[PDB]
Amino acid sequence: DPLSGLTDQERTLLGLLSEGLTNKQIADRMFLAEKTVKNYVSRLLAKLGMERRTQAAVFATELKR
């Protein structure tokens, strides 16, 4: 449960990622632009030591359980 380091919405970029959504879908759910999302997510992977959104999801998926 190492969610220490993730901003407000970065922990909520993990739950949307873990529902195998697309940047643009996750975008609408948050009122951003897809470009904005691409950024936040790509930062978040860096913060996580991962290089693919899929790893983030599975990792998130493991926390939720």
Partner DNA sequence: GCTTTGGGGACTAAAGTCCCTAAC
Partner DNA sequence: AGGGTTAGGGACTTTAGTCCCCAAA
Residues of this chain, 18-47, that bind DNA according to CB under 7 A: 21-24, 32-33, 35-36, 38-39, 41-42, 45-46
Stretch that binds a copy of itself, among 2-10, 27-35, 36-44, 49-57 (CB under 8 A): 49-57
Query: Smallest distance, Å, CB 43 to DNA?
Result: 8
- Look up tokens 């930062």; give the residue: 43
Using CA atoms, how far apart are residues 60 and 64, in angstroms rounded to an integer? 6
Residue 30 neighbours by CB under 8 Å, 6+ apart: 9, 12, 16, 37
State the residues that interact with a copy of itself by CB under 8 A: 17-20, 22, 50, 52-58, 61-62, 65
